[PDB]
Each structure stands twice: as structure tokens, then as C-alpha cells.
């Protein structure tokens, strides 16, 4: 129920099970060591996890082997990318650095 690093296929499958079938409030944060804007978004996501403590944000490094195919099977076109889930279905897909949309969605969905 905070920021959770996802490094393996198993961990991602479990996280998506919680977000979809499990209907738990879940955000997927796709990042990379080479992502410039993620350098100031990652801290923002940490502070937001304290504001919305029941949400789980799964932080995904797209360069990670093991989840190598999950990424290509997700059509990730840019880092950062954020996927928002509530009630078991996707409520948002913020592609690129847009913290306004991130904050608007966190409040609208998980307040």
C-alpha cells in the first residue's frame, strides 16, 4: 500500500491481478534510469503516496529483463507513462511528463 518496485514477470502479473480482477486502487509507473523528467516525478510520486495511503503505485523500470515482454505487450511509447486503475478497470493513461494530470487523477480517483 505504497510505492512497490516490480522487477519480475511474477511480480507484475500479481500487481495486474490486484489492479484488474482484484479491483484495488492501483497505479503503474513506467520509468527508466535514462528518463530525464522521471528525476522530478519519482519524488512527486513518493509524496503523493503519503497523501493517498491506500493506493499502490507499482514502479516499473522498462529496461528490466524478465518483464521484457510485458512492456512490448503494453505499447509503451514514452517514459514516463502512468496507468490508473480503480474498480478493476483503467481510468487513465498519462503518456509523457504531465504532473498536472497525475495529481488531478490521484485526487479524482482515490480521494
Number of beta strands: 5
Task: Determine the CATH topology.
Answer: Glutaredoxin
Total discrete domains: 1
Radius of gyration, Cα only, in angstroms? 13 Å
The SS-based structural class is alpha/beta
**H-E order:** EHEHEHEEH
Largest sheet: 5 strands, mixed
What is the share of helical residues? Answer: 25-40%
In short:
It is classed as oxidoreductase. The entry lists the keywords Thioredoxin, oxidoreductase. This protein has helices spanning 9-19, 38-51, 68-72, 99-110, and strands spanning 3-6, 26-31, 56-61, 81-86, 89-95.
List key phrases describing it.
monomer; 111 residues; alpha/beta; Glutaredoxin; five-stranded mixed beta sheet; 4 helices; 38% helix; globular; oxidoreductase; Thioredoxin; monomeric; Thioredoxin O1, mitochondrial
Helix-strand blueprint:
Elements: E1 3-6, H1 9-19, E2 26-31, H2 38-51, E3 56-61, H3 68-72, E4 81-86, E5 89-95, H4 99-110
Parallel strand pairs: 1-3, 2-3
Antiparallel strand pairs: 2-4, 4-5
Description:
- By secondary structure, the chain is an alpha/beta fold.
- It has a single domain (1-111), classed as Glutaredoxin, CATH 3.40.30.10.
- The protein has helices spanning 9-19, 38-51, 68-72, 99-110; strands spanning 3-6, 26-31, 56-61, 81-86, 89-95.
- It has a 5-stranded mixed β-sheet, sandwiched between helices.
- β4 and β5 form a beta hairpin.
- The protein starts with a strand and ends with a helix.
- It is classed as oxidoreductase.
- The entry lists the keywords Thioredoxin, oxidoreductase.
- The assembly is monomeric.
Amino acid at each position: 500500500n505504497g510505492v512497490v518496485l516490480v522487477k519480475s514477470e511474477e511480480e507484475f502479473i500479481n500487481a495486474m491481478s490486484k489492479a484488474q480482477d482484484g479491483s484495488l486502487p492501483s497505479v503503474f509507473y513506467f520509468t527508466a534510469a535514462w528518463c530525464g523528467p522521471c528525476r522530478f516525478i519519482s519524488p512527486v510520486i513518493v509524496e503523493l503516496s503519503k497523501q493517498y495511503p491506500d493506493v499502490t503505485t507499482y514502479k516499473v523500470d522498462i529496461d528490466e529483463g524478465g518483464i521484457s515482454n510485458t512492456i512490448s505487450k503494453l505499447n509503451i511509447t514514452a517514459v514516463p507513462t502512468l496507468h490508473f486503475f480503480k474498480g478493476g478497470s483503467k481510468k487513465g493513461e498519462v503518456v509523457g511528463a504531465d504532473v498536472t494530470k497525475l495529481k488531478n487523477l490521484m485526487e479524482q480517483l482515490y480521494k
